[PDB]
Curated annotation (Swiss-Prot), chain A:
Localization in the cell: Nucleus; Chromosome, Centromere, Kinetochore
Function: Acts as a component of the essential kinetochore-associated NDC80 complex, which is involved in chromosome segregation and spindle checkpoint activity.
Protein name from the UniProt record: Kinetochore protein NDC80
Annotated organism of origin: Saccharomyces cerevisiae (strain ATCC 204508 / S288c)
Additional remarks: Present with 1160 molecules/cell in log phase SD medium.
Family: Belongs to the NDC80/HEC1 family.
Complex and partners: Component of the NDC80 complex, which consists of NDC80, NUF2, SPC24 and SPC25. The NDC80 complex is formed by two subcomplexes, NDC80-NUF2 and SPC24-SPC25, which are joined end-to-end through their coiled-coil domains. It has a rod-like structure with a length of 570 Angstroms and globular domains at either end. The NDC80-NUF2 globular domains are probably directed to microtubules, the SPC24-SPC25 globular domains to the centromere. NDC80 probably interacts with SMC1 and SMC2. Also interacts with KIN3. Interacts with DMC1.
Part of the full-length chain shown: 594 to 663 of 691
Curated annotation (Swiss-Prot), chain B:
Localization per record: Nucleus; Chromosome, Centromere, Kinetochore
Role of this protein: Acts as a component of the essential kinetochore-associated NDC80 complex, which is involved in chromosome segregation and spindle checkpoint activity.
Similarity comment: family membership: Belongs to the NUF2 family.
Subunit structure: Component of the NDC80 complex, which consists of TID3/NDC80, NUF2, SPC24 and SPC25. The NDC80 complex is formed by two subcomplexes, TID3/NDC80-NUF2 and SPC24-SPC25, which are joined end-to-end through their coiled-coil domains. It has a rod-like structure with a length of 570 Angstroms and globular domains at either end. The TID3/NDC80-NUF2 globular domains are probably directed to microtubules, the SPC24-SPC25 globular domains to the centromere.
Coiled coil start-end: 1-31
Species of the source: Saccharomyces cerevisiae (strain ATCC 204508 / S288c)
Originating gene: NUF2
Note: Present with 1550 molecules/cell in log phase SD medium.
Protein name: Kinetochore protein NUF2
Residue range from the parent sequence: 402 to 447 of 451
Length: 70, 46
């Protein structure tokens, strides 16, 4: 019974090994995927800000044209 | 992993966020400068 109790301990340790390795690899992959997704999101935000700048420039040009034509 | 890859990825995320914040601040500075130019363009109508 001592042998089998420590054998159950050994089995739990091996299961914990597999779980720990899988969790560490999953954490690393999740961090990498989060970094890539954040890169994509910030690139999209930068593009949207540039588009907003272009929109403001267009507003200025339209206002100038409207005033000059009047 | 923790002190290395995970910490390095977190630091890279923070650096990317800082660079994005700097770019956003520059874009907003351009926005405010253009708005001030337009406000002055009101005065230049006279």
């Amino acid at each position: 019974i001592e042998i089998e109790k420590m054998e159950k301990k050994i089995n739990d340790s091996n299961l914990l090994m597999k779980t720990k390795i899988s969790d560490a690899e999953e954490l690393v992959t999740s961090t990498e995927l989060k970094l890539e997704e954040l890169k994509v999101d910030l690139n999209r935000k930068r593009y949207k800000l540039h588009q907003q700048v272009i929109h403001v420039i267009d507003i200025t040009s339209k206002f100038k044209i409207n005033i000059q034509s009047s | 992993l923790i002190s290395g890859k995970i910490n390095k990825l977190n630091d890279e995320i923070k650096q990317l966020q800082k660079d994005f914040e700097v770019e956003v601040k520059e874009i907003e500075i351009e926005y405010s400068l253009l708005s001030g130019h337009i406000n002055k363009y009101m005065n230049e109508m006279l």
